[PDB]
Design a protein around this ligand. Structure first.
Ligand SMILES: CCc1c(-c2csc(N3CCNCC3)n2)[nH]c(C)c1C(C)=O
Ligand SMILES: [Mg+2]
Length: 104
């Protein structure tokens, strides 16, 4: 438990500070992104994960990883792989995956 959640802190801090994290530090504003609400059923972002981590809302590290994967699934759902947001999501996705297995 304590082991599970301290890893998520480390990972989330390192994603928050990553160069390629700029598209995911705050929720997408659907007023600014035509089509987002229609296409992305379950939005997610790093600060939503931060807020949920801060109040203890993650019971296990598997839930935390589920939210992280959703960030990048939504990203690949909405943005082309060769777009600027797409390219950053791939970098962030691979960062998370490699950092995740460096514990589990
Ligand atoms: C293409 C829009 C988009 C962004 C995005 C673009 S610019 C930005 N910001 C930079 C820092 N200032 C605040 C906001 N975010 N991010 C995601 C996950 C998007 C989509 C739809 O998937
Ligand atoms: Mg892999």
């Amino acid at each position: 438990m304590h082991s599970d959640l301290t890893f998520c802190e480390i990972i989330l801090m390192e994603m928050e500070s990553h160069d390629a994290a700029w598209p995911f530090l705050e929720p997408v504003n659907p007023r600014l992104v035509s089509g987002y609400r229609r296409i992305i059923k379950n939005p997610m972002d790093f600060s939503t994960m931060r807020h949920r981590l801060s109040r203890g809302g993650y019971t296990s590290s598997e839930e935390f990883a589920a939210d992280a994967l959703l960030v990048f699934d939504n990203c690949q759902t909405f943005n082309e792989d060769d777009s600027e947001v797409g390219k950053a999501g791939h970098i962030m996705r691979r960062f998370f995956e490699s950092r995740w297995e460096e514990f589990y």
